[PDB]
Design a protein around this ligand. Sequence first.
Ligand SMILES: Nc1nc2c(ncn2[C@@H]2O[C@H](COP(=O)(O)CP(=O)(O)OP(=O)(O)O)[C@@H](O)[C@H]2O)c(=O)[nH]1
Ligand SMILES: Nc1nc2c(ncn2[C@@H]2O[C@H](COP(=O)(O)CP(=O)(O)OP(=O)(O)O)[C@@H](O)[C@H]2O)c(=O)[nH]1
Ligand SMILES: [Mg+2]
Ligand SMILES: [Mg+2]
Lengths: 211, 211
Amino acid sequence: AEALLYQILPHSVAEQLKRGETVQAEAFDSVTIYFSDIVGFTALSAESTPMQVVTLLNDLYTCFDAVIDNFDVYKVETIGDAYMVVSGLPVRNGRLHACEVARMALALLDAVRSFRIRHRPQEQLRLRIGIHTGPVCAGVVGLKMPRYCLFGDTVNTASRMESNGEALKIHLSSETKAVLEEFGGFELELRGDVEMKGKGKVRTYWLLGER
Amino acid sequence: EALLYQILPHSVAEQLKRGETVQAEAFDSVTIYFSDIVGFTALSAESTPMQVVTLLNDLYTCFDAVIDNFDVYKVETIGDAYMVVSGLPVRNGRLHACEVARMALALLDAVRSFRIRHRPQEQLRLRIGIHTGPVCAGVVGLKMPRYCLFGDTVNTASRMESNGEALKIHLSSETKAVLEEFGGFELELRGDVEMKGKGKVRTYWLLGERG
Ligand SMILES: Nc1nc2c(ncn2[C@@H]2O[C@H](COP(=O)(O)CP(=O)(O)OP(=O)(O)O)[C@@H](O)[C@H]2O)c(=O)[nH]1
Ligand SMILES: Nc1nc2c(ncn2[C@@H]2O[C@H](COP(=O)(O)CP(=O)(O)OP(=O)(O)O)[C@@H](O)[C@H]2O)c(=O)[nH]1
Ligand SMILES: [Mg+2]
Ligand SMILES: [Mg+2]
């Protein structure tokens, strides 16, 4: 009964609500947001019967949920093909959110390379990944069906970083690059250009891998 | 028991509960409605987390009671965005446009008396766009099934809202024809706007129905 009402909230919040306690809206000084989008999906889904695209979405969801569940991240929403995954949000963990998300991005890049579309087998699916780090305020909205929600400008900065990114590449801002470099062991390359979405003096980086 | 399939439409939920299986379908005509709050990023950026969480709860409670009066289906709700379609699960002729237009007018009426708890002397500004066209639908997801839509009319229904105006209902030229063959709706031409997809195209405003 209650186990099917708290199927969207994180496990910590689900246990908090189950035992009767109240969950307050909170502010977090640093969380890491990851935004992913499949490029060229409205053209591949424009030349398929209604069953092929449904099956492709089912297969992609089942493939991604088996990799997202390997880490400490929490998947906020999944509409269409876009994915939004946040780390550090429900229970704080210091500065490990950047490392967990940057490892999950490489894992998801490796998982896509073996994904097979069953109505065009000799073809690979392209992906776009953008990561950002910043403070957000989060809380539970809804009463008929509860849902964890986030507010802050870092969400839209992460979405914009994903939008400006390239296919099959991981696009980091300069706020998360500092954290990753301080942790050490990652490979980051300066993009060599400054984006023109909301500013003109912002430097962005490509993530290439980890040692 | 009731909350087993609370996300899916009543028809699809009953079909799954009975025991049968559902198939992806192609719909010849479906009407989509997209709305959002203009200026919400600058209003949640000067309020404490409890204020904005309670505001979101109030807004959801206000809108979900106006929606239930009409024959429509609420697809998704993220942040302040709202997506509502009609004609989708059970075809009902050309009645989707009329129901969606009536719902849009009722939602515009109901947001004039909405009260923000932490600023009583201010009202929220809505932005609404409506489109009609062929879309496909299917139930995707395992262990968490959900209805979803594929097509290009979703993109244009969203673009109509993105190019719209606050406290005004924007219509394409595809739904104006349906509403003028219905008769009884006051439509005023906006002009040859420059849509982000094609370019020079005629769109309209909706001002009210004469009863
Ligand atoms: N639930 C929603 N689905 C949408 C929306 N806009 C588009 N779509 C649908 O989801 C899919 C994504 O389309 P996008 O708007 O992201 C356009 P496209 O995929 O060409 O962009 P890129 O993949 O970034 O090149 C596509 O099938 C659309 O029909 C929206 O606002 N909400
Ligand atoms: N949970 C989510 N919240 C989002 C998402 N995208 C945006 N947002 C939140 O909603 C806020 C609204 O930003 P939008 O991009 O919708 C722009 P706004 O609504 O302020 O309208 P204009 O400024 O008139 O374009 C945004 O800054 C975030 O706090 C998303 O994918 N998921
Ligand atoms: Mg896409
Ligand atoms: Mg908004």
